[PDB]
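re: that complex we talked abt at group meeting.

here r the seqs, copy pasted straight from the sheet so there may be weird spacing, ignore it
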Amino acid sequence: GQQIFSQALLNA
Amino acid sequence: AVIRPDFKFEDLGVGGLDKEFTKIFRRAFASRIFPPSVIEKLGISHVKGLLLYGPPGTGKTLIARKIGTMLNAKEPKIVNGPEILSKYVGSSEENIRNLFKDAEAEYRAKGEESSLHIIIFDELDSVFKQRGSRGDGTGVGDNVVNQLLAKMDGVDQLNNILVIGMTNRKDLIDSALLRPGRFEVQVEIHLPDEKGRLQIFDIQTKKMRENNMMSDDVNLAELAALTKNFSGAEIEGLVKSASSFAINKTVNIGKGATKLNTKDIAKLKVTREDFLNALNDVTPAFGISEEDLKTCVEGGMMLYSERVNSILKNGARYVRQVRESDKSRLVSLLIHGPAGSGKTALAAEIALKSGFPFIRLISPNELSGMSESAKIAYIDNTFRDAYKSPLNILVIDSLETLVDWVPIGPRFSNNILQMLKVALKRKPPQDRRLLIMTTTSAYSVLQQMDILSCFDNEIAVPNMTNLDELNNVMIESNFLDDAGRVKVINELSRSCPNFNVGIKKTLTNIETARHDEDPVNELVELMTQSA
Amino acid sequence: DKFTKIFRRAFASRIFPPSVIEKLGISHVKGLLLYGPPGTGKTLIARKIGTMLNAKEPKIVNGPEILSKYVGSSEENIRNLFKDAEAEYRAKGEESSLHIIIFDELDSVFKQGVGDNVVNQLLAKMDGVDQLNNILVIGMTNRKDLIDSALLRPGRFEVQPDEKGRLQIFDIQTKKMRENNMMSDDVNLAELAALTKNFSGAEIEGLVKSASSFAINKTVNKDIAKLKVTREDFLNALNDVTPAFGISEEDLKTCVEGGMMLYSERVNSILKNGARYVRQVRESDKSRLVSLLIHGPAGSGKTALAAEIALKSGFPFIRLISPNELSGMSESAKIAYIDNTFRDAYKSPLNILVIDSLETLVDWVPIGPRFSNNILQMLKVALKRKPPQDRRLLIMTTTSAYSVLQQMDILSCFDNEIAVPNMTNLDELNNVMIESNFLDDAGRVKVINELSRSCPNFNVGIKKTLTNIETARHDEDPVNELVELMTQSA
Ligand SMILES: Nc1ncnc2c1ncn2[C@@H]1O[C@H](COP(=O)(O)OP(=O)(O)OP(=O)(O)O)[C@@H](O)[C@H]1O
Ligand SMILES: Nc1ncnc2c1ncn2[C@@H]1O[C@H](COP(=O)(O)OP(=O)(O)OP(=O)(O)O)[C@@H](O)[C@H]1O
Ligand SMILES: Nc1ncnc2c1ncn2[C@@H]1O[C@H](COP(=O)(O)OP(=O)(O)O)[C@@H](O)[C@H]1O
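got the structure back, here u go
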């Protein structure tokens, strides 16, 4: 019974 | 070197915290006072981490701001926590390992001759949270801690760096950084004491007093006495809120137009009533107590007979006994009598007259609406808190109600009863004292439960029976004129000489009679009906 | 030293000629799990094992450092770790030298998905297709419960400072200060060791630094030649550092804080009986369990007497189970605390256990009657269980509701009873009065005369007598208080 979000990094 | 030759700490703003300053100075910069040769001769290493923590608004950021200028230190590097993070990959870890370059360069250049470089991390708990949080996402919130830990532990012999971290919640900080060699010394900053509040009040009103802007009437000692639990920030807020009143007597905001009396501008002056009104506006956020007991005796005393005086004297004897002797570290008392005679008021009066540092009251009003486990936790926490200060008084009100007693079952809660039974007999830690005073109205029920062996002494509170006491309370209440008060008592003498009512019911009847018909036909009717 | 087990049992197969092992098929143990509280030196032992056995140079890797930035690179590192051992075994076979890998803080990464792929790689490489007996993996953790269940199975990890040492490490730390004639002769290192009972090395360094810090303060508000560390600094600095242990031997010393008075001979008789039973347990090899009940009227004094007997015994292990320790817990927690307290008494040749106020542990209230049956049954079962072979116990339990225990039919569980009656003769009151130096001779002579004409039969408990004397000392030292108060408490 859990859920999750997500973030993002750009390119070096 | 490490401290300026011209400094005495009297000029700096921070006041009310002197012991903490001495502790910090002794454990942080003491080792860097002598010439270096001694330290290696003594085999002692330098300290590297310092941690400050306390409730919101206690003065830590002020210390951080002024330490750099006060102690001839290199301009400290200040970085807010959430400013470290960045977008591109690898940017954050670089930003952390870009602050220490100057210290590394100076160390490599000048060996032990290098000066002291200090960097302070505001809002430490922002980024360095627990490194096992989980979440299955971008890991930039973990390599940050690893980078700082690598540059702080595997320092490669960097022994000229001191990091200061200020926070409000130690629990959230990652445990990996709380160990020897990394943030060793931890200093707690708590709320100020009465003398510290006088110091804070003086510091805040210095400039106001200097320019003759404060009226001579104001007395700082009284204000320091009144502000029971105010921290520094709340004291400053009180000062400016009080100044706003004085400002708002020449400039009338809203009403009318802008009418500025250019002559009263030069006579602007604060006074005492402004400060009292400001006390009215601002409120503390800590509170604990010292208000419930005051309101519990709002109706006041009447000394309608000698029994009140005798009971008060006995309470005074017991408080003296607990104050003087060192072998009597625990005393418990029971106050029992008929319902409505007035018991909580008497106990609250004795407790207030005692004047001990710690006082509190447990009553069913506070516990209402909680679940049973919550009630148990609340009682346990209150007792544990009371076990702290050198002298303590605790009042327990209406024991039978705290246990949910109803005589049809009979139903009652056994867990709470057993906890109270065990707790009323627990002596406090070494060199502390306690005085427990519990009141009840169902003496027999306590006898049946067999908890009557945990009380050292018992005090009865018989209700009044002589018409003289009724006359005394009547004259004190100013119900009627002298002729009426005489006439009512003469009529009641023959109407019903035998008398058993109480106290609370008497005042209630007096008020109802005042409202409708102060003549006999109402007050005496009700008084006879009740008895 | 008992260093002997690991050497004899695990590290014995490699001694034999390789062909015998290759032919029979005997398999060498693979995993060794060293566990204990922090600071025990698990890293030290792990390092020493490799050098002592002339094994390959250890590869030291930190637990948290295993976490990798790139996806799949952690698995790449884990698999790369084994390349040297695999190639060396391939080149030779049974002749490969012993390779050791130590993974500090195993539970940090090996919890029940980098931390999952690492386990996948390790388990794939460890067993099955591979029969590499030349690799020994040592796993050290401060918390044993956190280890993954995937690794806790047969065939994987099969095998699972003292006073003098504390003094030696103190000497090691102090060498530099002591040698340079900057230490006062008053400082007794053994005294400090006796003070520091539950401290680890880092704590010792902390105490040393803080103690020096006070000497630093003494100078700073060119006589540097007089900088000397004094014993006062060591005594004062003890308030900064703190341990993370617990002891209950102190609890058995505070219960007798009020002391003994020997107001009557029956006290001496009871003490003699207690010392007889303790000797009987000590000497006889058959009586491996003795149970005693101490019962009497409320307030007569029973916990103090039992605590005195236990402190006079002098056994290695002594403990107390009191209601105060259990307050605030739930039932399933009390039953486990009582079970653990008993299970910890079977690990020493001689043991004494004291149980206080039996009826209060059971939550007895006579209106219902209500009580907790679960705890009662647990105690009833425990009080008859014989300890393991060659170990002995002495259990003393104190109660005040003899009738209630009779009703529950639990009385069959005890072997002998001792009754403690409260004092009733004025001679005992005179003895207590002289012992407590309450009044001069005249007052202590007038009190007896005043009492004898009002209350011939005394029947008052000692606790009440002491508290009444204490409260009467203040109001009116003369008799005119005590005789009234006591008559009120008759
Ligand atoms: N000796 C006294 N002299 C004057 N007023 C008193 C006195 N004792 C109590 N009062 C007042 O009488 C009112 C009733 O007192 P209180 O609330 O303590 O009653 P109680 O007997 O504790 O109540 P309960 O019946 O709910 O248990 C309160 O206004 C209290 O201030
Ligand atoms: N045999 C004794 N001789 C002298 N003093 C004693 C003796 N027994 C008890 N005392 C004194 O009694 C004091 C308190 O008594 P204690 O706590 O043992 O009472 P108790 O009968 O076990 O209590 P409870 O009423 O809770 O069952 C102890 O501090 C000790 O000073
Ligand atoms: N001795 C003092 N203690 C606490 N606050 C003080 C003191 N002297 C002045 N102040 C005022 O209180 C505030 C300090 O609060 P601050 O330390 O910034 O809060 P936080 O603890 O959240 O950082 C400032 O407005 C400062 O002017």
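couple things i noticed - The radius of gyration of chain B is 32 Å. Residues C 257-261, 267, 298-305, 400, 462-463 surround adenosine-5'-triphosphate (ligand 2) (CB under 6 Å).
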